[PDB]
Amino acid sequence: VTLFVALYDYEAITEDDLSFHKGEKFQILNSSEGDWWEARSLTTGETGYIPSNYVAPVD
């Protein structure tokens, strides 16, 4: 799949969110018309929701 990269730091708002650091990489697990996607971090291996505007596709 296409991997994604964090444009900014994100501190979890909800208990289901993934926290992450700028530059962190992600597999995107689910991505709807959400403001929120669900992803898994490649640095911590943690899973949870992220803001879809905080990430960009890696190429």
Question: What do you see in this structure?
Answer:
The protein has one domain (1-59): SH3 type barrels (Roll). It is 0% helix and 41% strand. It has no helices and five strands. It has strands at residues 3-6, 25-30, 36-41, 47-51, 55-57. It has a five-stranded antiparallel β-sheet with strand order 4-3-2-1-5, with no helix packed on it.
In short:
With 59 residues, the protein is mostly beta strands. The protein has no helices and five strands.
Supply the CATH class.
Answer: Mainly Beta
Give me the count of strands: 5
Largest sheet: 5 strands, antiparallel
**CATH fold name, please?**
SH3 type barrels
**Global structural class:** mainly beta
List the helices and strands and how they pair.
Elements lengths: L2 E4 L18 E6 L5 E6 L5 E5 L3 E3 L2
Antiparallel strand pairs: 1-2, 1-5, 2-3, 3-4
Summary keywords:
59 residues, mainly beta, SH3 type barrels, 5-stranded antiparallel beta sheet, globular, transferase, beta barrel
